[PDB]
Design an enzyme around this catalytic site. Structure first.
Site, PDB file in Angstrom:
ATOM      1  CB  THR A  91      10.051  -2.306   0.323  1.00 26.09           C
ATOM      2  OG1 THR A  91       9.655  -1.584   1.844  1.00 26.09           O
ATOM      3  CG2 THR A  91      10.345  -3.608   0.479  1.00 26.09           C
ATOM      4  CD  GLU A 139       2.401  -1.445   4.220  1.00 22.38           C
ATOM      5  OE1 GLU A 139       1.771  -0.864   3.065  1.00 22.38           O
ATOM      6  OE2 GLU A 139       1.745  -1.907   5.202  1.00 22.38           O
ATOM      7  CG  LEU A 149      15.778 -18.598 -15.021  1.00 21.82           C
ATOM      8  CD1 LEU A 149      15.993 -18.310 -13.719  1.00 21.82           C
ATOM      9  CD2 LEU A 149      14.820 -17.367 -15.553  1.00 21.82           C
ATOM     10  CD  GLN A 167       1.243  -0.424  -2.708  1.00 23.59           C
ATOM     11  OE1 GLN A 167       1.271  -0.080  -1.774  1.00 23.59           O
ATOM     12  NE2 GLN A 167       0.905   0.445  -3.938  1.00 23.59           N
ATOM     13  CD  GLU A 206      17.379 -21.248 -24.533  1.00 23.94           C
ATOM     14  OE1 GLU A 206      16.600 -22.156 -23.995  1.00 23.94           O
ATOM     15  OE2 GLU A 206      17.310 -21.083 -25.957  1.00 23.94           O
ATOM     16  CD  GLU A 229       8.007   6.921  -7.307  1.00 21.26           C
ATOM     17  OE1 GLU A 229       6.871   7.301  -6.659  1.00 21.26           O
ATOM     18  OE2 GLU A 229       8.215   6.122  -7.902  1.00 21.26           O
TER      19      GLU A 229
HETATM   20  N1  LIG Z   1       2.461  -1.125 -11.986  1.00 18.96           N
HETATM   21  C1  LIG Z   1       2.408  -0.892 -10.611  1.00 18.96           C
HETATM   22  N2  LIG Z   1       3.112  -0.132  -9.805  1.00 18.96           N
HETATM   23  C2  LIG Z   1       2.989   0.143  -8.641  1.00 18.96           C
HETATM   24  C3  LIG Z   1       2.074  -0.738  -7.690  1.00 18.96           C
HETATM   25  N3  LIG Z   1       2.286  -0.392  -6.656  1.00 18.96           N
HETATM   26  C4  LIG Z   1       3.135   0.613  -6.490  1.00 18.96           C
HETATM   27  N4  LIG Z   1       3.375   0.808  -7.850  1.00 18.96           N
HETATM   28  C5  LIG Z   1       4.810   1.938  -8.172  1.00 18.96           C
HETATM   29  O1  LIG Z   1       5.881   1.752  -7.188  1.00 18.96           O
HETATM   30  C6  LIG Z   1       6.244   2.911  -6.782  1.00 18.96           C
HETATM   31  C7  LIG Z   1       6.226   2.970  -5.285  1.00 18.96           C
HETATM   32  O2  LIG Z   1       6.870   1.798  -4.784  1.00 18.96           O
HETATM   33  P1  LIG Z   1       5.985   0.709  -3.883  1.00 18.96           P
HETATM   34  O3  LIG Z   1       6.101  -0.751  -4.459  1.00 18.96           O
HETATM   35  O4  LIG Z   1       4.432   1.270  -3.954  1.00 18.96           O
HETATM   36  O5  LIG Z   1       6.758   1.128  -2.159  1.00 18.96           O
HETATM   37  P2  LIG Z   1       7.541   0.061  -1.518  1.00 18.96           P
HETATM   38  O6  LIG Z   1       8.208  -1.075  -2.417  1.00 18.96           O
HETATM   39  O7  LIG Z   1       6.285  -0.718  -0.711  1.00 18.96           O
HETATM   40  O8  LIG Z   1       8.501   0.653  -0.385  1.00 18.96           O
HETATM   41  P3  LIG Z   1       7.999   1.321   0.838  1.00 18.96           P
HETATM   42  O9  LIG Z   1       6.319   1.554   0.990  1.00 18.96           O
HETATM   43  O10 LIG Z   1       8.282   2.855   0.826  1.00 18.96           O
HETATM   44  O11 LIG Z   1       8.456   0.822   1.956  1.00 18.96           O
HETATM   45  C8  LIG Z   1       5.472   4.064  -7.450  1.00 18.96           C
HETATM   46  O12 LIG Z   1       6.153   4.473  -8.757  1.00 18.96           O
HETATM   47  C9  LIG Z   1       4.139   3.472  -7.867  1.00 18.96           C
HETATM   48  O13 LIG Z   1       3.727   3.965  -8.913  1.00 18.96           O
HETATM   49  C10 LIG Z   1       1.375  -1.435  -8.433  1.00 18.96           C
HETATM   50  O14 LIG Z   1       0.546  -2.318  -7.839  1.00 18.96           O
HETATM   51  N5  LIG Z   1       1.413  -1.730  -9.893  1.00 18.96           N
HETATM   52 MG   LIG Z   2       5.142  -0.147   0.869  1.00 19.81          MG
END
Ligand SMILES: Nc1nc2c(ncn2[C@@H]2O[C@H](COP(=O)(O)OP(=O)(O)OP(=O)(O)O)[C@@H](O)[C@H]2O)c(=O)[nH]1
Ligand SMILES: [Mg+2]
Ligand SMILES: CC[C@H](/C=C(/C)[C@@H]1C[C@@H](OC)C[C@H](O)C(C)(C)[C@@]2(O)O[C@@H](C[C@@H](OC)[C@H](O)C(=O)O1)C[C@@H](OC)[C@H]2O)CO
Ligand SMILES: C/C(=C\c1csc(C)n1)[C@@H]1C[C@@H]2O[C@@H]2CCC[C@H](C)[C@H](O)[C@@H](C)C(=O)C(C)(C)[C@@H](O)CC(=O)O1
Ligand SMILES: Nc1nc2c(ncn2[C@@H]2O[C@H](COP(=O)(O)OP(=O)(O)O)[C@@H](O)[C@H]2O)c(=O)[nH]1
Ligand SMILES: [Ca+2]
Ligand SMILES: [Ca+2]
Ligand SMILES: [Ca+2]
Ligand SMILES: [Mg+2]
Lengths: 351, 54, 439, 428
Positions: free
Chosen positions: C145, C71, C252, C11, C254, C183
């Protein structure tokens, strides 16, 4: 209600400060690993500074300045004085000192031997001392004039030592013919205001000073712990070899005509200011995410010409027995309550 | 305050300012690890189904 | 021209990727349509922007990017959003169910099943590269992920593209916006397995961005959207040298050469200025000296830490807008007398400076004000190890009681991997301590 | 992670389950005929989690209704939204379970269980990506307790990698039907410790105390009790039913809430709860929601959270409010009372906000706590169990169904182990 944690039990000062905080009723003490604290009374080594200031909704304060060890380590203090564009060797109140690394584990050996050719044929007293960065509580010091006796005494122990020029002419206290060191306590708050405790103490030698007997350093390097041991004349004048400022002022007016305020304390305020302002930009928590304050213990050595010299700066000092209540209350008043208010005039002098 | 390697173009420029001089695991290994973890999951599920069968 | 492929994982990687490519398009004058009027070379070219964009015979400029998530709902928005025509379906890859904030689930269980497709889609982009230099990987530390799948991906990339450089943009977890208790586990686990596979990683602490948005943009409760628009500005500053004509950080390799002397110590601290609210009517424009001095303020850093108590190994200043070298030199001279800037003994006390005349581009209707000059400092300082210390402590608290550990073992991971990952982190803190401190 | 299959078993299970569907159907703008009639697309974005789509824009609850006697389910068909349930998803026997766990689990229930699994299977096969299952039942009767846990075990066999979640109503002498309730509950808890990922402990003792002490109801009915449960079930499923970042599915919720596989018994809570009557149209505030939701007297499991510590906490706020104020309020509760949250799980309190408030309220808050104090609930049941078992009282109803005393001894032993395991972390 404010919260704090205690991470150093062995602190006599901050055990009293802690006891004071609880008795106010507006402070609650937490487990050592509860991160949700306002105040940290931290450990003496490897204090986790990087973990401070990361709790949302919490203003945090610690009873130590990060980096303040550059004044408090014996070996680091010498290095800082010499290589500073504020102190440099334009420092007229600190005994000549050289850092000596052992020849097994950079170093100023041919600076201690190169500058030694000055009193050898110069026919001046070549007396030197040997101190550790962290000696055995109160032992690990060897005073001798033989240049080759000290450059091998440091290679006999397993750490770095500093060879400091010994004051062959220390100021004498009468009746007794003794040599003393002066301890002043300094409190630096979060705003980096320098607060000198009005009441200092004198660690006196309970035996007559001896220029001859060198291997017996019991009337030299007087520390209120070793002194009690070897002294077969323990405190004929004052309890626990402690002479206080009101009395030392009287002895000064009687046997030296001048006073304590006149020049000696003057040179002291200059020394404390010089050291702490030198290190200000490096350790200040001006715009940091957490705040710092710290209690310092400056040790001084005066001589025959009433000139003040600087021995060490103690980063974790204990106070004199009779001043504990007053000083610790003062710490709470200007260092803690100034950050965390409740719901005169003070005992400090803002340098 | 020595400025070295100045390079200019229409988009901008770059340079260096010196204040003071000085003084792996194979694809097969990865497959082995992924398969080992999968095997452990299968064993844990097998033990569960065994417990449920009892 | 040497191409760069961007990979966005999870995400956080995907949403930040969205923000970055939007901003890239604005900076290069590329329509959401994909057309680039200013580009007179149709269906090809060797321009600097071609490092990030390929071209079709119909004049569409296609991002050299792959979006991957376990997802579909986040990537779905890209598919149905403003810049939907920019990408083609092969670049957007989605699974059915996510890693549930579980590194083990992302790395072993689900990762095993999708890894080969991802690599194949990446191979397709690589096949259209006359001289691929490497990859830019975007992901969170805390997600299942972002942590688990990324580290698996990085291992395979080292195998399939041994010579190529790999750069990271990593989101360090912060409770104020975090979505999972575990986390710190995921963060340590992914850093351990990724460490030897990454050449240079830019860590962004969500806490720092969050506070910057509150403090300087006057946003009461910052959203991911607010956070990502600020993050993309930082990222753009860092990648600008790859997308525009210039002589600094032009490839890269560099980045590693200029910022990473010791391979393991590859986490540069980013600091950016100025950040000005778009709502402020009367704003006075900061000088070169002011934005440069601000680079040494902890409040402006992407990771909150104190560089005064650490040592520099390298320092890069990346300016955008109205800046001339004379003013940079004047600024550095003044700052050096008023700041604690100590380098390690085996490194020159110096600054690599790059200037791009085009002022920062801002998203219309965004939170950021248009400014005349901005700077991003990249400094390799041992002080960033503070972030590892914080993370490692949270790890220790939970792991000593084996809290949540069964979730990971249940996915086939062994408990030993926890200890092996934690020990590597302890060595990493030790490495920083040797470099940055003297006894 | 999309579809959830809902199962309701027994009298209590079907009564609370029926109300749950009434409440969320209203929230999602679904009328008793299954037709959408709302004004927001927020209502439909994640509608597929609990509803299937039929022909004519019809939404049908992915729900299976189970009982060993037809009475309660006749009431469900006749009640509001009775027409909304799929007719083929009604699975029922004629004999009843006579408040007997053994009958539900081993004899009467065993005959009916396969036909229930057929319906479950039919619903699961139709799922794009099944998250898992939720079950509503009581632990004190026979069907919900005995057959409910039998179902859970069977489902886990066919779906070992799906999440199993229950809303389990705990018996209490304050609201009691038979003396054998502690037997049925101890036997069920033993099943729950092994085969569920999350169990919301809905204590009828707490619900009663809330109706009496807090709401000033002299004579609390099941209707009153179920309104509390209905509101709480709506709140605890908000993150599943509406777009959001936190605990957006069953597995992520479990990973955030369950540090050890056995300790998955949650203490739910709802706010506001206010007696009549200068407090119905009164503007509610974020600080008032936060202080109540954390108050010991507001917990829906009869235990004192002040005697224990929180392993994890989930908090859900609903309605239009200031997120800045929510954050500040959640922070001060933790900062001012840090001792009640274990230090070895950093940041163990998680907050979610949803814009759509529940019916009749401008804003609300739902509490979900994993507290070591929950041991007081199991300890209570254990004492009642032991008082009878030491004299082997009423055992003949169970041995007459083929059970022997050893099985009772095991269940007792397992629940006492659960209690001591909660105690271990209360001092850790
Ligand atoms: N800066 C920023 N942080 C994000 C964002 N989305 C999620 N996070 C951070 O990412 C962490 C959660 O990881 P995600 O990327 O949401 O989860 P994922 O990689 O999709 O993995 P899963 O959902 O468990 O399969 C948390 O610390 C959130 O604060 C975003 O859009 N911007
Ligand atoms: Mg996710
Ligand atoms: C933090 C978790 C939580 C634990 C505690 C102790 C919490 C904290 C706070 O609520 C969130 C208290 C709250 O801020 C108040 C002080 C305003 C207050 O409501 O406290 C209660 C008494 C208190 O227990 C003593 C309460 O029953 C309780 O449960 O408190 C008297 C009441 O008299 C008007 C008033 O003075 C359990 O989930
Ligand atoms: C309207 C309510 C609270 C409230 C609204 S404004 C304010 C200051 N408080 C809550 C509603 C919560 O959904 C739960 C309803 C619980 C219903 C009761 C158990 C019972 O059925 C009913 C007869 C009542 O006790 C009241 C009508 C007094 C009910 O409003 C109490 C209550 O707090 O409802
Ligand atoms: N809260 C609540 N509890 C109920 C309800 N109906 C029964 N119970 C409780 O459930 C237990 C009896 O189980 P029950 O569901 O009636 O038996 P079953 O039909 O065999 O599952 C007792 O503890 C009752 O207090 C209800 O509608 N609401
Ligand atoms: Ca072109
Ligand atoms: Ca029959
Ligand atoms: Ca069959
Ligand atoms: Mg009944």
């Amino acid at each position: 209600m404010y919260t704090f944690v205690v991470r150093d039990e062995n602190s006599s000062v901050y055990a009293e400060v802690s006891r004071l905080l609880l008795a106010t009723g507006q402070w609650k003490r937490l487990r050592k690993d509860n991160p949700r604290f306002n105040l940290m009374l931290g450990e003496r080594n490897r204090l986790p500074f990087g973990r401070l200031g990361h709790e949302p909704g919490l203003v945090q304060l610690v009873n130590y300045y990060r980096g303040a060890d550059k004044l408090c380590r014996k070996a680091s203090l010498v290095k800082l004085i010499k290589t500073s564009p504020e102190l440099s060797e334009s420092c007229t109140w600190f005994p000549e000192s050289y850092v000596i690394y052992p020849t097994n584990l950079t170093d100023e050996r041919e600076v201690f031997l190169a500058a030694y050719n000055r009193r050898r044929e110069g026919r001046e007293g070549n007396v030197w001392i040997a101190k550790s960065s962290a000696g055995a509580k109160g032992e690990g010091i060897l005073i001798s004039s033989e240049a080759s006796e000290l450059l091998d005494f440091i290679d006999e122990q397993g750490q770095v030592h500093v060879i400091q020029k010994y004051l062959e002419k220390p100021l004498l206290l009468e009746p007794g013919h003794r040599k003393f060191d002066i301890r002043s306590w300094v409190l630096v708050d979060h705003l980096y205001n320098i607060y000198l405790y009005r009441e200092g103490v004198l660690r006196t030698s309970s035996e007559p000073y001896n220029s001859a007997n060198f291997q017996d350093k019991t009337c030299h390097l007087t520390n209120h712990c070793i002194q009690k041991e070897y002294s077969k004349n323990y405190g004929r004048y004052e309890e626990g070899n402690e002479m206080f400022f009101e009395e030392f002022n009287q002895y000064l007016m009687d046997a030296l005509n001048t006073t304590l305020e006149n020049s000696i304390l003057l040179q002291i305020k200059h020394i404390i200011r010089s050291c702490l302002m030198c290190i200000e930009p490096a350790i200040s928590t001006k715009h940091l995410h957490y705040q710092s304050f710290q209690l310092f213990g400056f040790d001084f050595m005066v001589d025959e010409e009433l000139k003040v010299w600087l021995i060490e700066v103690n980063g974790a000092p204990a106070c004199a027995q009779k001043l504990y209540a007053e000083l610790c209350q003062g710490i709470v008043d200007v260092a803690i309550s100034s950050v965390f208010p409740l719901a005169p005039t003070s005992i400090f002098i803002k340098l | 305050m020595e400025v070295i390697e100045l390079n200019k173009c229409t988009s901008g420029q770059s340079f260096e300012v010196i204040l003071k001089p000085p003084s792996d695991p194979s694809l097969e290994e990865i497959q082995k690890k992924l398969e080992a973890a999968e095997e452990r999951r299968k064993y844990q599920e097998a033990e569960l189904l065994k417990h449920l069968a009892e | 021209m040497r191409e760069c492929i961007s990979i966005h994982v999870g995400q956080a990687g995907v949403q930040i990727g969205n923000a970055c490519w939007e901003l890239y398009c604005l900076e290069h004058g590329i329509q959401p349509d994909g057309q680039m009027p200013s580009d007179k070379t149709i269906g090809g070219g060797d321009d600097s922007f071609n490092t990030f964009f390929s071209e079709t015979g119909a004049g569409k400029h296609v991002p050299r990017a792959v979006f991957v998530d376990l997802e579909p709902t986040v990537i779905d928005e890209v598919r149905t959003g403003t810049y939907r025509q920019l990408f083609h379906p092969e670049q957007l890859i989605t699974g059915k169910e996510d890693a549930a904030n579980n590194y083990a689930r992302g790395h072993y269980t689900i990762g095993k099943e999708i890894i080969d497709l991802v690599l194949d889609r990446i191979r397709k982009l690589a096949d259209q590269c006359t001289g691929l230099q490497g990859f830019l990987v975007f992901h969170s530390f805390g997600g299942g992920t972002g942590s688990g799948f990324t580290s698996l991906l990085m291992e395979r990339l080292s195998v399939d593209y041994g010579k190529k450089s790999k750069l990271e943009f990593s989101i360090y977890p912060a409770p104020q916006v975090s979505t999972a208790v575990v986390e710190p586990y995921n963060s340590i686990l992914t850093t351990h397995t990724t460490l030897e596979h990454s050449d240079c990683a830019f860590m962004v602490d969500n806490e720092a961005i969050y506070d910057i948005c509150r403090r300087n943009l006057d946003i009461e409760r910052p959203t991911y959207t607010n956070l990502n628009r600020l993050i993309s500005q930082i990222v753009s500053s860092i990648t600008a040298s790859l997308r525009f004509d210039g002589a600094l950080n032009v490839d890269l390799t560099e980045f590693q050469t200029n910022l990473v002397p010791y391979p393991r110590i590859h986490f540069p601290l980013a600091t950016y200025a100025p950040v000005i609210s778009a709502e402020k009517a009367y704003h006075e424009q900061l000088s070169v000296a002011e934005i440069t001095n601000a680079c040494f303020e902890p409040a402006n850093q992407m990771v909150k830490c104190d560089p005064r108590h650490g040592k520099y190994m390298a320092c890069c200043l990346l300016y955008r807008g109205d800046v001339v070298p004379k003013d940079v030199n004047a600024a550095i001279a003044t700052i050096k007398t008023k700041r604690s800037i100590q380098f390690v003994d085996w490194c020159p006390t110096g600054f690599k400076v790059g200037i791009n005349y085009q002022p920062p581009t801002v998203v219309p209707g965004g939170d950021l004000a248009k400014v005349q000059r901005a700077v991003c400092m990249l400094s390799n300082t041992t002080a960033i190890a503070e972030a590892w210390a914080r993370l490692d402590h949270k790890f220790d608290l939970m792991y000593a009681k084996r809290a949540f550990v069964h979730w990971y073992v249940g996915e086939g991971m062994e408990e030993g991997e926890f200890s092996e990952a934690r020990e590597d982190m302890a060595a990493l803190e030790k490495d920083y301590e040797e470099v940055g401190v003297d006894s | 992670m999309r579809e959830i299959v809902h199962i309701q078993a027994g009298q209590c299970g079907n009564q609370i389950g029926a109300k749950f569907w009434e409440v969320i159907s209203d929230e999602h703008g679904i009328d008793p005929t299954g037709s959408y009639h709302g004004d927001s697309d927020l209502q439909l974005e994640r509608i597929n989690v609990y509803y299937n789509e039929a022909t004519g824009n019809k939404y049908v609850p992915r729900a299976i209704l189970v009982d060993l006697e037809p009475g309660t389910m006749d009431s469900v068909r006749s009640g509001p939204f009775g027409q909304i349930f799929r007719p083929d998803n009604f699975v029922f026997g004629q004999s009843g379970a006579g408040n007997n766990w053994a009958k539900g689990h081993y004899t009467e229930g065993a005959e009916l269980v396969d036909s229930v699994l057929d319906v479950v299977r039919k619903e699961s096969e139709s799922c794009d990506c099944l998250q898992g299952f939720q079950l509503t039942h009581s632990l004190g009767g026979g069907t919900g307790s005995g057959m409910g846990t039998l179902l859970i075990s069977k489902i886990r066999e066919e779906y070992p990698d799906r999440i199993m979640n229950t809303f389990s109503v705990m018996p209490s002498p304050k609201v009691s039907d038979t003396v054998v309730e502690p037997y049925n509950a101890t036997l069920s808890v033993h099943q729950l410790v092994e085969n569920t990922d999350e169990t919301y402990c809905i204590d009828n003792e707490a619900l009663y105390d809330i109706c009496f002490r807090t709401l000033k109801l002299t004579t609390p009915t099941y209707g009153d009790l179920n309104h509390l449960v209905s509101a709480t079930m709506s709140g605890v499923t908000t993150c599943l039913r509406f777009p959001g970042q936190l605990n957006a599915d069953l597995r992520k919720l479990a990973v955030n809430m369950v540090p050890f596989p056995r300790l998955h018994f949650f203490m739910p809570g709802f706010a506001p709860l206010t007696s009549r009557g200068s407090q119905q149209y009164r503007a509610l505030t974020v600080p008032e929601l936060t202080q109540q939701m954390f108050d010991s007297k507001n917990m829906m499991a009869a235990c004192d959270p002040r005697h224990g510590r929180y392993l994890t906490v989930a908090a859900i706020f609903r309605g239009r409010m200031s997120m800045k104020e929510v954050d500040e309020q959640m922070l001060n509760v933790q900062n001012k009372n840090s001792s009640y949250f274990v230090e070895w799980i950093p940041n163990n309190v998680k907050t979610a906000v949803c814009d759509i408030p529940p019916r009749g309220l401008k804003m609300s808050a739902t509490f979900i706590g994993n507290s070591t104090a929950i041991q007081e609930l199991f300890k209570r049941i254990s004492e009642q169990f032991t008082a009878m078992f030491r004299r082997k009282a009423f055992l003949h109803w169970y041995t007459g169904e083929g059970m022997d005393e050893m099985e009772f001894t095991e269940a007792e032993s397992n629940m006492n182990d659960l209690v001591s395991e909660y105690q271990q972390y209360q001092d850790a």
